């Protein structure tokens, strides 16, 4: 009832440059976050067992 | 009482769910000593081969002995009745009060 849809049409935009920046932090927090997991994991475990 | 085989046929049962529980706990302890294995400390390395090893071990065996009963009913089979005698014996414990009325120098 909003509107007749036709809402999402293709488009192109490029890729960003790459560098040190940025993939190099995420994948490190990647990791935080992961090991994070690993720490609840052993927790639950811990808790369950 | 029960037949004996059935006496050690339970206590190798029990005794195996003791080992499952023996099991769980181990994965317990090598669950918690991995994650400060992860944390960096360096100390309680060679703890972790010993755990492991266990672990492994009384994971193995205890399905080999369990194995082993199911085993042992496969060759089982083939190896109210007490009705058949029940009057019977009521009818000697009924004689034998008798007894014990006929005499009065034992009803002390």
């Given at each position: 009832k909003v509107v007749k849809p036709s809402s999402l049409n293709s488009?192109?935009?490029?890729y960003v440059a790459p560098t040190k920046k940025e993939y190099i932090e995420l994948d490190i927090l990647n990791k935080?976050?992961?090991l994070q997991s690993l720490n609840e994991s052993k927790d639950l475990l811990r808790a369950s067992f | 009482?029960?037949?004996?085989?059935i006496q050690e046929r339970l206590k190798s049962l029990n005794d195996i769910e003791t080992q499952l529980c023996s099991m769980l706990q181990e994965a317990s302890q090598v669950t918690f000593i991995f994650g400060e294995l992860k944390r960096g400390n360096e100390s309680?390395?060679?703890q972790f081969e010993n755990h492991v090893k266990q672990f492994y071990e009384r994971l193995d065996k205890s399905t080999t002995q369990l194995r082993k009963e199911i085993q042992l009913l496969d060759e089982n089979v083939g190896t109210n009745?007490?009705?058949?005698?029940?009057?019977t014996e009521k009818m000697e414990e009924q004689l034998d009060l008798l007894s014990a009325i006929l005499d009065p120098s034992k009803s002390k």
């Open positions: 488009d192109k935009i490029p935080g976050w992961k | 009482m029960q037949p004996p085989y309680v390395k060679p009745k007490k009705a058949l005698g029940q009057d």
